[PDB]
Design a protein around this nucleic acid. Structure first.
Length: 1621
RNA sequence: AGAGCAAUCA
């Protein structure tokens, strides 16, 4: 049935004695027990498919039986002759294999009893802290000091005192103040030549050098005296342009000092006099009158007043002005990295009236100067006692000079995100503080003041201000460490967890280097002391204390979880040093491989002899062996039901029989890191053709090779001599030529210059130096990051025997659909036959790159080659559907909603069954376990998967052999290549200081090899489905083992993600005797110890610290759920709103952040934080791209200057507008709703109607838009235009010019936003030529069409190129149908300007600085002038825009979601009758969705957390617009190649005449009007489509659809929140 | 002086 096709060519290959390795024989020989022998285990293993015989085809049964007979013949036994004999043997087997679970149960009970007695008990938390400090002191001697005057800087690198007096005025004020007598006073750091030098330097630079000037602020130094030069040079000598000093955790002096620091900072913040600014304007717009974001304003009146009071406190506590000063100073410091030299300096002044920075030429050093009044002098001295060098007095003021500093670009960006970070932290902490929010509710907005506060509330406010500043201005790494400890130290209020003292004893890092984080450490210590003192409301009886903001009288656990996780998630990412981070990341697999190698008996040099028979129920690296195959057989038998249907579904849905470019994963542009090196033949032939007469004529590769071998002769003479001996016959000739070269004197030599030799030279030089350096009878290679699409193009070229690109070979074959194609497994078998040949095993080589994981500890990403990527795709996608049939598995998720769906399904099913089973039973106990495995990749085995390939009943004999061969080569041939820069750094350090090395220097033979072996550690992310299938198999085996206990009945449930586990267990019966036998005091303790023992038997290492068992709380990955009620956890979206952006435009960034705003609205956030989230995303977008109000490059200012009739809130977001949509259309529809509402409002205003029903009823009748356009034309002709008509003209022309926009040569088969408009304005990216030159498709393009196309004859070549494009339009119009449409499309992608900038490699952090430099520049006109001429061209009428107006009206009206949301939003009853009976943020739930998911019916909920569908798919019209605009563009290029003044053609061919008729009018609009009435819908056989009609079908029906209706669905409420009433 | 703790950037 269903025509089972042989999907391989390896039909005659068996898993044993036919594949490349004989490891299967000793895998078998290591599996024999005392009761089950060799013929028994091979009978079961190679013939257990007979249970899956009712649902397989006859060819499948015959092939598997022939494979069984061949394998049993190969393994030297007598096979069974018939199926009935095999079934009789198999039922005898199933008896002797079912007699194992009792032995396994006794083994885990003995293991639990053995592990119980070995532990040591920590007496208390203080002793745990002392033991951690003692072991850290043993690791680092003399680290702890008692002198506080030698620690690090306290208040980061920033100092912002408030100023009381209302660019050159501040500078000459500092000039006037800095000319008094020398009354310089120095201070001790905690109660002096550098201070004298810096004081003389600042007084010289402020007296004699500031008045040669440039750019009104930057001055140099040449024409001054010798004494002034000496003072300046001493100042820069001071500037410079283990040694750990730590303080203990039990210091009370640091606590008192930090309390005084907090009080002095709060006194300092209450002195500012400014009341206008840039951040203040946007935040006061969004939060001063927050009723403009809601629809039903009158039904809630406490929430909006609380938001207003928080905004008033932010205004009165200088939060906005402090953030503005930080952002301005960071922008100035980023800008100051310019073409200046070391003898010139810059003066930086922000809008603050008395703060000055002296910036000099790693970073930019600077000096800060402040002028404080007499009343705040002592508080300034206390608050900044660490960082004051000197101060003096002038009149009634004090002048302060601060220390020299230095900052990196990432820290400058982190300080640049201060207005996004700080105010939302202030808002959330002030909301979560109970006494603060009740005082704000008690007092009125006219009477809230700082000086009217109770002392407790004032202390809470001081803690909130200090915590908000220290969170939003994070620069160091000790804060990152203590917040990671605060992340993992929240497991106190649960049951048995085994990390109340062990986690603090092991994983705590006492890296306290200043006195500000002593506050956080004391807060977490107070919380743990209170917890150890001894749905769910917490803190009303625990009486605990918030870690950041003290905040007594806690309401719920949700507030503390959100506060702590917001503090975790609002840290930067890329703050680690590159060399140290990469050495640690390369050191972890080296030691984790040396541990396995030294444990299991292998020495360093030998290979990976697979099974030593020590992989049998041991501790470190072992499985049971004879239990794993029974568990896998039982899992397959209970899981796989229909083998033929499952195989057919795999072949259809995953596309095994499709060509490789039809696979989405193997086609997209990622990095694959192939190997590339210059061969030795090139080097020796370059040395042969090197001419002593042409020493001065050496340019390029010859010079690079010559410098490399000159450095090799200077450093490793014997190595180079033996290299010449083993690679050239005329070694003496090469040696004497070397002597003649080095005796010429026309070259340059180099000493030890660290990584600068790599940095400022050619890569060819350093790679030939490494190759000539590390010659040890081997081949050393480096890795270069290539592209996946480019490697697929090269592989498709190589499969068709096209070694070199030929003009006629590609074009001669591939006619139509019925031309030559290929399949994925044909390519895979060709690639495997290539890679099995002897080539040095270069295909299995991995490069390691650094991921950014927001923590001080860092993860890594691995780059595997194309061949290994294809075998991993094969394995991981033939195991994808096996996980899709498992209901207890959660890697086959439909996004993020399904995770919560099956988590709540597990919890509510086990709670319901416990409530059912509790009635009239003997005893009942329930437990849950949130588990996290220790090391999922390094500590696990890989030969456990070979045992799982064989038992698969889906596969047949021949594909399982190929998978076994792939895995056996993957284990044995894998190695990791060290990057060249850190390799040379390690070699230099070992040469000059160490002469000995660590585990990496033991795996490498004394740092003489670039690559080191890693074998049993399959790297992270490579096997994500197989490991989860094995995890579920292990859990099912655990349940079947628990079934064997006689006294009690156990029911287990589990949810499996890779490296995750959420187990739940109900036990009934003799629970006391059961717990006595299991040596546990409670069921969570039993579950913890039994799961640990069983997983250790299944080679899965459980982490005893970061895993906890409880009785009512489950945590799968996040968003913990208690008693069937979920905890929201919106703080991830809250922190993502303020930190992460794409930095590609303003429009795209605004929609990307609005996605997070919508998701935060769906996750159930309080009403107060919503305007601050609006302001935060607006501050980020406007501060990076379209400048925030108060400066040049605005948009409202440009509109006001040009006098456009649109209002301030009517600007669309593509023109630089603001996110001004209401909240319910945002939460339901999405970020495109503001553009839709703007267009709908101007459409209703122009058509003079009242309701959407009337508008659509008038539009649906014909002869209406024509008469409206005729009336508008007559009004423009007479000149009696109105405001509504001008707005409609502007928006019609905006929609018409959005089709043109700029850089619109993109194919864009799938868009990101599905928005109605386009981007319109794009700053040109940083485009190079070297990265374009490295591409092999670019080399093929430059070889096939010559160097005239590299960057008369060029015109005719481009004419021929577009002629062959016009002759085959399917190449540029469709994604590649077959061969002769993919590779030549890749060559065709390089034609014309503005098509080669689609290949971009700029990171998201190196693009923001480029955009900051680019926006204040000419890229040539300007940004503001480009915008001004765009509105000047847009304000005119322009003719034949009726079709654009009609399509705009149709696209607005036709949306079913909009047309069903708008009347029910306009006519929704406000409250009651089971709508709005609660008011504590229980209106954000009901009025958001309950009329809507009752309008779109199928629900009964009142309080829910939503995971929505992709119902707003507004992308079925923009893709036709893009496709026929692309066809119009290439037709325009062809006809402009033909002739000029193309308005009417000269009667060429039929395609030219039809394209002339197309572009006489608007082609996209008239083909839309044609497809509106025609219903052809041809079958796309690529034969009759050209026969029927060329142009209109070829750019109408070839987008696989026309303009049709959308679909609505009921928003998919995952599960309820806890219902309140 | 500042950043970091593989003996690193200035």
């Amino acid at each position: 049935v269903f025509f089972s096709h042989w999907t391989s060519k390896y039909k005659e290959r068996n898993p044993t004695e036919i594949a490349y390795s004989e490891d299967i024989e000793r895998i078998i020989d290591s599996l024999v027990t005392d009761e089950i022998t060799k013929e028994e285990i091979i009978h079961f293993l190679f013939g257990n498919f007979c249970f899956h015989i009712e649902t397989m085809n006859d060819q499948h049964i015959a092939d598997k039986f022939k494979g069984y007979q061949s394998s049993c013949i190969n393994l030297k036994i007598e096979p069974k002759v018939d199926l009935a004999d095999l079934k009789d043997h198999l039922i005898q087997k199933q008896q002797i294999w079912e007699s194992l679970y009792g032995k396994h149960l006794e083994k885990i009970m003995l293991r639990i009893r053995e592990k119980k007695k070995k532990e040591k008990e920590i007496p208390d938390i203080t002793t745990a802290f002392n033991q951690n400090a003692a072991e850290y002191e043993e690791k680092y001697p003399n680290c702890f000091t008692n002198d506080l005057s030698e620690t690090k800087t306290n208040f980061s690198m920033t100092w912002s005192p408030s100023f009381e007096k209302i660019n050159n005025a501040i500078i000459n004020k500092f000039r006037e103040s800095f000319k008094s007598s020398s009354r310089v006073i120095y201070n001790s750091p905690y109660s002096t030549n550098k201070a004298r030098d810096i004081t003389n330097l600042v007084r010289l630079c402020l007296t004699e050098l500031s008045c040669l000037t440039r750019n009104k602020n930057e001055f140099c130094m040449k024409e001054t005296g010798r004494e002034n030069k000496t003072i300046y040079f001493k100042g820069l000598a001071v500037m410079n342009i283990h040694m750990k000093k730590l303080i203990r955790h039990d210091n009370e002096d640091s606590l008192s000092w930090c309390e005084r620091i907090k009080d002095s900072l709060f006194v300092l913040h209450n002195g500012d006099i400014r009341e206008e600014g840039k951040i203040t304007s946007v935040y006061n717009n969004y939060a001063k009158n927050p009723e403009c974001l809601y629809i039903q304003d009158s039904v809630l009146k406490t929430e909006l007043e609380t938001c207003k009071k928080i905004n008033k406190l932010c205004n009165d506590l200088a939060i906005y002005h402090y953030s503005e000063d930080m952002m301005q100073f960071s922008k100035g410091l980023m800008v100051a990295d310019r073409y200046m030299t070391k003898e010139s300096f810059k003066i930086l002044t922000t809008a603050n009236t008395s703060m000055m920075l002296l910036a000099f030429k790693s970073g930019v050093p600077y000096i800060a100067l402040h002028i404080v009044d007499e009343d705040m002098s002592d508080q300034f001295n206390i608050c900044y006692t660490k960082e004051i060098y000197s101060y003096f007095r002038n009149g009634s003021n004090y002048i302060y000079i601060m220390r020299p500093q230095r900052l990196n670009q990432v820290r400058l960006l982190s300080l640049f995100k201060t207005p996004s970070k700080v105010p939302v932290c202030f808002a959330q902490f002030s909301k979560k503080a109970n006494e603060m929010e009740k005082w704000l509710k008690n007092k009125d907005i006219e009477k809230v003041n700082v000086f009217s506060m109770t002392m407790t509330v004032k202390q809470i406010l001081i803690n909130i201000v200090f915590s908000s500043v220290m969170i939003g201005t994070v620069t160091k790494l000790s804060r990152m460490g203590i917040f990671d400890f605060m992340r993992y130290a929240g497991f106190l209020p649960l049951s048995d967890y085994s990390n109340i003292k062990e986690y603090i004893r092991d994983k705590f890092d006492p890296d306290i280097t200043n006195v500000a984080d002593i506050y956080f450490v004391n807060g977490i210590k107070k919380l743990l002391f209170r917890m150890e003192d001894l749905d769910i409301i917490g803190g009303i009886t625990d009486l605990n204390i918030k870690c950041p903001i003290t905040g007594s009288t806690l309401l719920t656990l949700e507030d503390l979880y959100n506060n702590v996780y917001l503090a975790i998630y609002m840290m930067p990412k890329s703050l680690h040093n590159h060399v140290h981070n990469l050495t640690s990341l390369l050191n972890v697999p080296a030691e984790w491989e040396l541990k396995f190698r030294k444990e299991l008996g292998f020495n360093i040099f030998e290979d990976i002899y697979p099974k030593k028979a020590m992989f049998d129920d041991k501790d470190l690296f072992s499985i049971n062996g004879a239990l794993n195959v029974k568990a896998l057989s039982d899992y397959y038998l209970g899981n796989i039901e229909n083998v033929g249907l499952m195989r057919s579904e795999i072949e259809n849905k995953e596309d095994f029989l499709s060509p490789c470019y039809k696979i989405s994963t193997l086609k997209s542009s990622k990095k694959c890191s192939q190997s590339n090196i210059i061969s030795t033949d090139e080097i020796i032939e370059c040395l042969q053709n090197a001419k002593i007469q042409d020493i001065e004529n050496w340019k390029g590769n010859n010079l690079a090779i010559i410098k490399g071998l000159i450095r090799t002769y200077n450093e490793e003479k014997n190595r180079l001599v033996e290299f010449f001996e083993d690679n050239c016959v005329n070694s003496l000739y090469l040696v004497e030529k070397l002597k003649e070269i080095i005796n010429s004197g026309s070259i340059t030599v180099g000493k030890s210059v660290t990584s600068k030799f790599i940095r400022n030279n050619h890569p060819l030089t350093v790679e030939t130096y490494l190759k000539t350096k590390l010659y040890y009878r081997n081949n050393v290679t480096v890795l270069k990051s290539k592209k996946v699409s480019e490697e697929l193009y090269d592989l498709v070229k190589q499969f068709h025997n096209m070694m070199e690109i030929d003009l006629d070979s590609v074009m001669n074959l591939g006619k139509g659909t019925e031309g030559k194609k290929h399949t994925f497994l044909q390519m895979l078998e060709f690639v495997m036959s290539k890679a099995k040949n002897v080539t040095g095993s270069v295909d299995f080589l991995v490069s390691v790159f650094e991921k950014m994981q927001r923590t001080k500890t860092d993860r890594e990403i691995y780059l595997m080659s194309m061949k290994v990527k294809m075998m991993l795709y094969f394995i991981e996608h033939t195991f994808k559907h096996v996980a899709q049939s498992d209901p207890s598995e959660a890697i086959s998720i439909s996004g993020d909603n399904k995770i919560r769906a099956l988590s709540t399904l597990s919890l509510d099913t086990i709670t319901s069954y416990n409530d059912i089973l509790n009635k009239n039973s003997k005893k009942s106990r329930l437990a849950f376990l949130s588990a996290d495995q220790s090391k999922w990749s390094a500590s696990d085995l890989t030969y456990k998967y070979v045992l799982a390939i064989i038992l698969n009943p889906i596969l047949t004999t021949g594909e399982a052999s190929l998978m076994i061969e792939c895995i056996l080569m993957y284990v044995k041939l894998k190695k990791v290549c060290i990057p060249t820069d850190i390799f040379l750094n390690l070699r230099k350090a070992q040469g000059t200081f160490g002469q000995n090395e660590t585990a990496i220097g033991l795996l490498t033979k004394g740092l003489t090899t670039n690559t080191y072996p890693v074998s049993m550690n399959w790297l992270q992310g490579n096997l994500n489905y197989l490991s989860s299938v094995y995890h579920s198999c292990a859990m099912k085996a655990y349940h079947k083992t628990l079934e064997c206990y006689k006294d009690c009945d156990f029911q287990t449930r589990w949810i499996v993600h890779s490296d995750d586990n959420a187990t739940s267990l109900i036990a009934s019966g003799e629970v006391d005797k059961m717990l006595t036998d299991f040596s546990s005091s409670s069921l969570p303790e039993m579950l913890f110890r039994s799961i640990e023992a069983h997983f250790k038997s299944f080679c899965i290492t459980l982490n005893p610290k970061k895993s906890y068992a409880s009785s009512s709380e489950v945590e799968f990955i996040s968003e913990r759920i208690v008693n069937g009620a979920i905890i929201p956890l919106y703080c991830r979206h809250l922190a993502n709103c303020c930190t992460e952006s794409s930095h590609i435009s303003y429009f795209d960034d605004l929609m990307s952040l609005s996605i997070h705003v919508t998701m935060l609205l769906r996750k159930g956030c309080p009403n107060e934080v919503i305007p601050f989230a609006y302001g935060a995303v607006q501050v980020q977008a406007l501060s990076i791209y379209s400048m925030l109000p108060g400066e040049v490059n605005d948009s409202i200012r440009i509109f006001k200057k040009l006098g456009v009739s649109l209002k301030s809130n009517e600007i669309p977001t593509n023109m630089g507008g603001w996110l001004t949509s209401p909240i319910e259309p945002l939460s339901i529809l999405g970020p495109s709703s503001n553009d839709q509402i703007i267009y709908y409002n101007v459409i209703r205003d122009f058509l003079n109607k009242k309701s959407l029903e009337e508008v659509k009823d008038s539009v649906s009748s014909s002869s209406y838009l024509q008469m409206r356009f005729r009336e508008l034309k007559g009004k423009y002709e007479k000149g009696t235009l109105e405001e509504k008509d001008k707005k409609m003209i502007f928006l019609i022309n905006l929609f018409e010019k959005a089709s043109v926009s700029e850089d619109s040569d993109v194919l864009t088969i799938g868009m990101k936003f599905q928005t109605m408009l386009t981007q319109i304005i794009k700053l040109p990216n940083f485009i190079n030529e070297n990265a374009l030159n490295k591409m092999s498709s670019y080399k093929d393009f430059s070889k096939l069409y010559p160097n005239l196309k590299k960057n008369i004859a060029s015109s005719l070549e481009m004419e021929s190129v577009h002629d062959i494009m016009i002759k085959n339009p399917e190449t540029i119009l469709i994604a590649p149908l077959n061969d002769r449409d993919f590779l030549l499309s890749q060559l065709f992608m390089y034609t014309s300007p503005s098509k080669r900038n689609q290949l971009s490699n700029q990171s998201t952090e190196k693009l923001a600085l480029d955009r900051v430099l680019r926006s204040k520049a000419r890229t040539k006109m300007t940004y503001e002038e480009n915008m001004e001429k765009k509105i000047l061209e847009m304000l005119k009428f322009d003719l034949d825009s009726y079709c654009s107006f009609k399509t705009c009206v149709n696209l607005v009206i036709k949306d079913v979601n909009f047309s069903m949301l708008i009347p029910i939003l306009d006519s929704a009853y406000p409250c009651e009758s089971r709508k709005r009976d609660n008011y504590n943020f229980r209106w954000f739930q009901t009025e958001k969705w309950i009329p809507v998911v009752e309008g779109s019916p199928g629900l009964v909920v009142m309080h829910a957390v939503y995971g929505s569908n992709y119902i707003e798919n507004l992308g079925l019209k923009n893709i036709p617009l893009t496709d026929d605009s692309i066809n119009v563009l290439t037709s325009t290029f062809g006809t402009g190649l033909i002739m000029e003044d193309v308005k009417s053609l000269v009667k060429g061919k039929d395609s030219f005449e039809t394209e002339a008729f197309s572009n006489s009018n608007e082609c996209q609009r008239l083909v839309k009007a044609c497809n509106y009435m025609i219903a052809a819908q041809n079958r796309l056989l690529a034969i009759n489509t050209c026969f029927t009609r060329k142009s209109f079908p070829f750019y109408s029906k070839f987008n696989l659809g026309r303009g049709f209706i959308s679909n609505t669905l009921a928003l998919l409420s995952t599960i309820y929140s806890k219902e309140e009433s």
